[PDB]
Amino acid sequence: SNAIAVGSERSADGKGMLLANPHFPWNGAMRFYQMHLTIPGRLDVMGASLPGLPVVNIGFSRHLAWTHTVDTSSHFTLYRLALDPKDPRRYLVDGRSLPLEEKSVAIEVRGADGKLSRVEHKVYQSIYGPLVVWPGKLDWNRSEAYALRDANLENTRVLQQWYSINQASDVADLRRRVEALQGIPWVNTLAADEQGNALYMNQSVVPYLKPELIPACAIPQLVAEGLPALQGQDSRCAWSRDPAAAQAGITPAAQLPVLLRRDFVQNSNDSAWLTNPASPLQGFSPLVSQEKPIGPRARYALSRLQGKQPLEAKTLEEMVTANHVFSADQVLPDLLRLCRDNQGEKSLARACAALAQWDRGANLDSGSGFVYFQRFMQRFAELDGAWKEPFDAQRPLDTPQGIALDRPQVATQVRQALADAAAEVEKSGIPDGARWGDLQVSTRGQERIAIPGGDGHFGVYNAIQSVRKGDHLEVVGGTSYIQLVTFPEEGPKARGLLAFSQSSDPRSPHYRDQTELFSRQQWQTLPFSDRQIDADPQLQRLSIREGSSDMPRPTGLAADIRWTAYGVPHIRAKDERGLGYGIGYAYARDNACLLAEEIVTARGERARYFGSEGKSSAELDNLPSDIFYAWLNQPEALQAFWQAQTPAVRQLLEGYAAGFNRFLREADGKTTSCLGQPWLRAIATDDLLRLTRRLLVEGGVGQFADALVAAAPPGAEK
Numbered sequence: 001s002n003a004i005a006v007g008s009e010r011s012a013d014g015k016g017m018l019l020a021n022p023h024f025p026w027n028g029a030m031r032f033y034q035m036h037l038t039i040p041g042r043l044d045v046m047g048a049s050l051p052g053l054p055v056v057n058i059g060f061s062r063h064l065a066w067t068h069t070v071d072t073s074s075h076f077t078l079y080r081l082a083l084d085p086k087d088p089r090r091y092l093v094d095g096r097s098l099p100l101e102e103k104s105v106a107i108e109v110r111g112a113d114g115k116l117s118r119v120e121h122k123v124y125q126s127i128y129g130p131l132v133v134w135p136g137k138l139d140w141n142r143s144e145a146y147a148l149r150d151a152n153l154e155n156t157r158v159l160q161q162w163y164s165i166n167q168a169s170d171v172a173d174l175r176r177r178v179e180a181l182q183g184i185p186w187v188n189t190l191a192a193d194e195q196g197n198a199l200y201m202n203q204s205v206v207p208y209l210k211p212e213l214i215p216a217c218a219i220p221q222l223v224a225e226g227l228p229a230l231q232g233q234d235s236r237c238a239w240s241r242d243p244a245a246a247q248a249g250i251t252p253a254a255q256l257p258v259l260l261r262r263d264f265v266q267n268s269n270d271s272a273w274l275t276n277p278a279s280p281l282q283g284f285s286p287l288v289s290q291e292k293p294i295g296p297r298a299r300y301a302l303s304r305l306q307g308k309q310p311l312e313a314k315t316l317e318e319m320v321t322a323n324h325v326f327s328a329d330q331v332l333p334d335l336l337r338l339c340r341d342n343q344g345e346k347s348l349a350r351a352c353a354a355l356a357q358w359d360r361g362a363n364l365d366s367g368s369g370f371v372y373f374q375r376f377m378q379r380f381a382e383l384d385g386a387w388k389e390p391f392d393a394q395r396p397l398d399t400p401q402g403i404a405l406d407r408p409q410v411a412t413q414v415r416q417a418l419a420d421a422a423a424e425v426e427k428s429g430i431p432d433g434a435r436w437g438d439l440q441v442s443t444r445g446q447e448r449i450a451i452p453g454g455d456g457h458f459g460v461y462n463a464i465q466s467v468r469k470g471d472h473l474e475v476v477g478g479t480s481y482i483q484l485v486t487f488p489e490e491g492p493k494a495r496g497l498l499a500f501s502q503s504s505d506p507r508s509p510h511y512r513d514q515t516e517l518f519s520r521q522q523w524q525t526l527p528f529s530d531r532q533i534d535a536d537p538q539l540q541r542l543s544i545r546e547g548s549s550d551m552p553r554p555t556g557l558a559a560d561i562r563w564t565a566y567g568v569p570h571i572r573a574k575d576e577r578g579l580g581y582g583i584g585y586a587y588a589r590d591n592a593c594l595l596a597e598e599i600v601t602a603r604g605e606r607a608r609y610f611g612s613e614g615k616s617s618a619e620l621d622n623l624p625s626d627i628f629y630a631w632l633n634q635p636e637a638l639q640a641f642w643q644a645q646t647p648a649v650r651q652l653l654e655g656y657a658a659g660f661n662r663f664l665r666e667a668d669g670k671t672t673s674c675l676g677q678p679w680l681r682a683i684a685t686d687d688l689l690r691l692t693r694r695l696l697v698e699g700g701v702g703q704f705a706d707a708l709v710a711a712a713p714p715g716a717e718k
Contacts, residue, residue, distance in 0.1 A: 001069035001269060002297060002461055003188070004305065004316055007262035008196025012310040013486065016171075016192030019316040020058050020067030020483040023456060023463045025476065026442065026500045028617030029598040029694060032058075032481040033587060034498050036528065036570040037166065039579060045166040046528050046570075048481035048498065051587070051595050052691035054580045054652040055162040058481060060492050060528070063170050065485035066191035068184075072271045073206045074287045075186045076150040076700035077239070078138070079128045079232030080219050088142050088713045091126060094235050101125045105630040107623060109607040116608065121627045124711060128232060129153075130631070132707035141714050147232060148708075149239070150700030151205045154247055156644035157183030158696055163649060171197040171260070178203045179253040182246035186699025188267050194487035200265035200275045202257040205250050206288055210240045214285060228287055257281045257289050264305050268297035268456075277302065277397060293391045296459030300326035302397055313486050313495070319461050320482065321521045323362040323452050326459030328373060331380065332360065334388065334403035338415060348415075351376075351422035362454030362462070364437030364519070368430065370454065371439070375421035377458060383417065386410045429471065437519075440466050440473040442500065444512040449519050451475045482523060494526035502567040503590035508671040510567030510590060527564050536564040544585060546662060557581040557658055573655075576648045580655025581662075588663035593674040595660070600679050602690035604630035609679045620705060628705040632697065633690045641689050653685045 002021035008014045024030050029051055036046035037056060047059015058067045084090035084097045091098055103123045108116045124131045126147040132138060138146040152158075161183025168174040170193040178184060178201060189201040207228070209217060217237035222229035230237045239249035246253075257272035259265050265275050272281040272289040281289060294302075303326075304319055305311070332355065339352035351372045358369025380386060388402030389395075404410040430439065437450035456463030456478070464478035482496035499518040502510040517524065527533045540563045547556030559582025560572040567590060571582035587595065598617065600606055606614065606622035616625045642650070661682045667675055674680045694702065701708065 002267070002301065002463075003067045003069050003190040004264060004266045004301060004319075005190045005192040005198035005200070006264045006311050006316075007192065007198035009262040010264055010311050011196065012312045013488070014196060015194050015487045016065070016196050016198065017311070017313060017316070017487075018060070018065040018067060018190070018192040018483070018485045019319070020065070020481070020485075020496075021320055021461070022058060022067065022069065022480055023478050024480040025617075026478070026480070027476070027504065028594075029601070029691065030698075031500070031504060031591075031594065032498060033591065034481065034502060034526075034566075034568045035583060035586065036568070037579060037583070038570070038572045039574065039576070040572065043167055043579075046494070046526065047483060050695065051591065051598055052656075052688050053159070053162070053695075054583045054656045055159060056166050057162055058483065059166075060483065060485045060494055061166075061168070062492060063194045063487070064168055064174060064191060065193075065483070065492070065494075066165065066168075066174060066189055067483065068187035068189055069267045070269050071186065071188045071202055071204055072269070072292075073186075073202060073204060073289065074228035075152055075205060075207070076148055076228065077207050077287075078132070078219075078222065078227055078229040079126070079147045079149065079237075080222075080229060081126060081131075081145045081147055082233035083143055083145060085142075088140070088145075089124070091145065092233050093127070094233075098127065100131070103631065105604070105627055107604060107607055107626045107630060109623060110609065110611045112611075119607075119623065121709070122712075123627070123631050123708065124713070126232070130701065130708050131711040132704045133711040134707050135710070138707065140711060145711075146229075148701050148704055149207070150697055151207050151247075151250055152185045152696045152700055154249075155183060155185055155205050155696060156641055157181050157246065158185055159649045159652075159692060160646055163652070170195065171199045175199060175201065175258070175260070180246075182250065182253055185696055188272075190265055190267060192485070196262055198261050198263070198265050200257070200259040200267065200272070202272045202289060203253060204256075205247065206256065208240045208242060208245065208249055208251040209237075209285065209287065211285065213237065213240065214287075223286070251285070251288065255284075255288070257284060264311070266298065266301050266305060268295060268301060268461075270294045270298050274298065274302065274396065277306070291393070293396065295457070296327050297456050297461055297463065299397060300324070300459050300461055313484055317484055317495070317523065320479070321462065323366070323454065323460060323462050325360050325362055325370065325373065325454060326461075327377060327457075328360045329459075330401050331377070331403055332373065334405055335376070335414075335418070338403070338405060338411070338418070342415060347419045348422060350426065351418055362436055362452060362460050362464070364435065364450050364452050366436040368425070368434060370436050371430065372421060372425050374455070374458065375424050376418055379417035379421055380414070383410070383413050386414060440464065440475065442475045442515060444515065445506045448472065449512060449515050451519060452521065453479055479518075483526065484523070491529045494528060495523050496526055497523050498566070503671065504594045505591065505671055505673050507669070507673050508567070508590055514566050524565070526568075533562055533564055533570055538565040539563070544581065544659070544662065546658065557655055559585070559659070561586055576651035577655040580652040580657075581659040582655075584656035584659025584661075585663050586659075588660045588667075589671055592660070592663060592667065592672050593680065595683070596674065596677075596680045598691060599683060599687045601625060602629050602633060602694045603687070604628075604633065605679075624706055624709040627709045628702075629690070629694065631708070632701075633693055637693070638686050638689050641693065642685070650685075653688050656688060657683050657685050
């Protein structure tokens with residue numbers, strides 16, 4: 001993801017400005033959805049949300065705009081267990097042998113003969129949490145095992161936190177509300193307001209270790225490799241408690257990175273360190289933020305942001321729409337000289353021709369030199385000491401740079417890498433003169449739409465990730481909800497797109513209408529004021545209600561919904577229950593089948609409906625996925641989560657479930673491709689809690705779902 005907030009000292013109008021370019025999946029449980037929420041007098045926010053959540057996750061209001069990027073802080077720790085020498089199912093803490101707890105979950109599996117069979121699976125747990133096995137790295141033998149403690153399993157505040165963000169007035173209010181609750185699971189927050197403040201916060205839920213414990217409690221070999229691993233045989237390595245923290249064991253808000261400026265702040269998934277290089281952020285826990293070389297996207301952004309010239313909205317938009325492959329700036333000059341040094345090497349002629357004509361872009365009409373450049377860079381990354389100027393901590397924005405062609409060993413390996421890359425490109429089936437837009441597409445029914453952009457690891461700010469499918473590259477994730485917000489006199493001016501369009505259902509009018517615009521890179525107004533909404537010739541309006549009494553006076557659930565162009569709903573209600581009612585109904589109209597599928601996943605019922613050979617939209621096998629979510633979303637966990645919700649959040653969720661179900665009752669297939677399927681059914685608030693918790697652990701134990709399912713104690717092997 002990318003984010004840039006510009007303040008009064010650098011903006012062309014002297015006010016705040018925000019570019020939100022989150023990079024997220026184009027399908028599944030993290031597919032963004034645009035909506036505008038209003039409870040007149042006290043809530044008025046617009047942006048995009050994630051499936052099943054009745055709050056705006058990235059968006060803007062009258063005076064404020066905010067967005068998020070995945071951060072580099074740890075949101076869990078691994079614990080290396082010391083096993084009981086007498087018993088591999090017991091482990092030692094302060095030399096005392098403790099038994100592992102055993103939790104069995106039962107999964108129903110649809111077999112080839114259509115019958116259901118029951119599968120029982122044991123999940124072993126320690127005082128820290130479940131055991132995890134990565135064969136060859138985190139084993140469970142007779143000496144050691146590994147447990148995982150996820151900090152967000154106890155974060156019952158996540159929905160309250162975004163509802164609170166949705167009510168924030170300006171940057172200072174937003175900061176207060178986030179630091180007060182500490183409900184953000186695993187993202188940075190960047191924001192700008194009309195008075196020209198630009199805010200960066202690494203304010204998320206992070207395991208807390210007092211500084212004196214961190215070197216003693218770490219596992220050096222695992223930490224050096226990138227895992228937050230601690231000594232689990234020592235009770236002194238438990239997360240530290242500080243009553244200023246909102247949650248037992250997490251890092252107090254005052255110890256997390258914050259930068260409040262009036263020039264700019266930026267983040268492209270590196271640490272807090274170089275958010276703005278004029279004020280580096282340093283001295284934090286390694287669980288929080290480290291001074292690691294920035295990736296090419298952030299290096300690109302900083303190359304465009306530094307200096308003293310004022311920044312216009314158009315400048316930020318074109319940082320996305322230029323599709324510049326910034327990694328080429330570092331190697332392509334040296335690479336093209338090697339090409340000029342080896343004319344008549346027939347093995348390099350096509351590659352060198354394509355790389356020389358190339359516009360250095362990932363545009364629809366960029367030539368095949370992009371493909372040659374990608375395959376080369378995949379090999380260049382594996383070479384040792386091939387940079388002319390290696391990374392230099394005192395030049396962290398300008399290094400590494402160039403190829404060390406003057407060393408004949410580097411020259412030999414680089415030329416071989418280019419030959420191998422050329423061979424791979426030509427081995428694969430791609431026409432002569434094919435262009436990048438001819439290769440990378442998003443399928444919509446039986447047709448394709450050409451998609452610009454390229455992988456973010458090549459320094460394309462418009463990051464697009466794709467996989468080979470048949471004859472093409474199918475987009476699976478990247479640029480998603482785009483929002484560029486400025487604050488002129490009359491109200492917030494928001495511009496952007498939802499790259500993959502509002503609806504995942506091929507029957508919907510809003511299945512590919514913004515994707516056509518994304519292909520052409522034509523961003524649109526995001527209408528927010530009543531005047532803007534009223535000016536839309538596509539405007540449609542629906543009022544819905546159901547429930548208690550209903551008279552001699554207004555009772556029950558009620559919402560007013562207006563849709564503007566591209567199927568963007570604007571939901572007005574007098575309370576949270578009515579607001580949720582409108583959200584659930586509108587979301588179901590566009591995405592009922594998606595939500596039903598993701599609820600099956602979060603209920604651990606994939607194998608029941610689809611058998612063991614299928615996968616979830618997260619690409620986990622159905623039965624391991626079911627085991628994980630049956631373990632994650634046990635009744636006791638859901639009940640405790642529900643009991644911790646505020647009245648307002650409970651009401652939002654109750655309304656959402658009722659509005660979703662209202663659409664299902666009335667649907668006749670106009671926009672719903674799965675009517676009649678046994679897994680498309682009425683939902684409950686528990687189902688929304690299952691989705692919420694599934695999202696909660698995406699920064700923690702969820703990433704280890706396969707490792708949890710694989711964790712079993714050794715037998716009698718040598």
